Amino acid sequence: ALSIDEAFRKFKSRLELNEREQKNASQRQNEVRDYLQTKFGIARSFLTGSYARYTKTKPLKNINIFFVLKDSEKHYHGKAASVVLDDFHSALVEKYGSAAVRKQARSINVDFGVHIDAEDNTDYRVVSVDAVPAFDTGDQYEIPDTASGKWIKTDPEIHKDKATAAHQAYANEWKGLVRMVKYWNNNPKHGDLKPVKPSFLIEVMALECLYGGWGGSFDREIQSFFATLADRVHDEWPDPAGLGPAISNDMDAARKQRAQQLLFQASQDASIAIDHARRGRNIEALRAWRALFGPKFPLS
Ligand SMILES: Nc1ncnc2c1ncn2[C@@H]1O[C@H](COP(=O)(O)OP(=O)(O)OP(=O)(O)O)[C@@H](O)[C@H]1O
Ligand SMILES: [Cl-]
Ligand SMILES: [Mg+2]
Numbered sequence: 060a061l062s063i064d065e066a067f068r069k070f071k072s073r074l075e076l077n078e079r080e081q082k083n084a085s086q087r088q089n090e091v092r093d094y095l096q097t098k099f100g101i102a103r104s105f106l107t108g109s110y111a112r113y114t115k116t117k118p119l120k121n122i123n124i125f126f127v128l129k130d131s132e133k134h135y136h137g138k139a140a141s142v143v144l145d146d147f148h149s150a151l152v153e154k155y156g157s158a159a160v161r162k163q164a165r166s167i168n169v170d171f172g173v174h175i176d177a178e179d180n181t182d183y184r185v186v187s188v189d190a191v192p193a194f195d196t197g198d199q200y201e202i203p204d205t206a207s208g209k210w211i212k213t214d215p216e217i218h219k220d221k222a223t224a225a226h227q228a229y230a231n232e233w234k235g236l237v238r239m240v241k242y243w244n245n246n247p248k249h250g251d252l253k254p255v256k257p258s259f260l261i262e263v264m265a266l267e268c269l270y271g272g273w274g275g276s277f278d279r280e281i282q283s284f285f286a287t288l289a290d291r292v293h294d295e296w297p298d299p300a301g302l303g304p305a306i307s308n309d310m311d312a313a314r315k316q317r318a319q320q321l322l323f324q325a326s327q328d329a330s331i332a333i334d335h336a337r338r339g340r341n342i343e344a345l346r347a348w349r350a351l352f353g354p355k356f357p358l359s
Contacts, residue, residue: 067277079183100129140203289322299359
């Protein structure tokens, strides 16, 4: 019979990237890069965002690939964001069909048609990539921004370095706790709209909302993490690197109130699980944790 710690560590391992998934991400990168280089001047590409920080939850969706545009494409830098995104969109629809391709704020999503079963298993295949037109300006990158109509600065290496620093200060448990809350945020039980938008905001908040080092127990850490996220979701959350626009403006007021309510509900659901465990009702506690997170949380 599983202890609470044993169950959380199994959950954590189920959310870790493995070698077969990595090989699949690399293969999709080759496929999309080789194609896009026939349509645009692209010097190089790279896997980035949460995928590269080991903070992307499962199943693996919306893996960012920056496609670094050559000087021959510099005309795009002085044009509206929708122009380069339109061109990337049309190219990718031509190859993958309209149903598979979706415009996003700072990327085009390509969905490979990989089946996600009800247990969140894909036979070790990535679900989709976010294709990002990008210019390397020297100090950082610039990518298209639908909200402003223009281009914004981003340095994913600052995000990576600070995720690594938080993780080292948290006894190597920070990244896993982030992936667990992102798994909860993705739970179909919440409906069509996730509690927190974008998912990246959970990680930005966690840089401040996990603190004091690792406390030693997953269940208390998760409870307090949810409670802190509820209390702070209305704060301003700038780009931590100080380069791009704030991360906290994608939710309108009603959406943020809902975010706070669902995060607080999660903190209460976690408290119930903690109370079960305190009283020796261990299979009851595991059932409470599974109802909160979803099927990847184990009962045995
Ligand atoms: N406002 C911003 N300013 C600068 N960089 C940003 C901004 N928003 C996002 N980023 C960078 O772009 C990356 C991709 O954003 P995206 O929303 O696609 O999430 P992601 O990395 O896939 O994370 P998740 O798995 O949580 O969705 C981020 O991880 C971050 O490095
Ligand atoms: Cl959403
Ligand atoms: Mg993404």
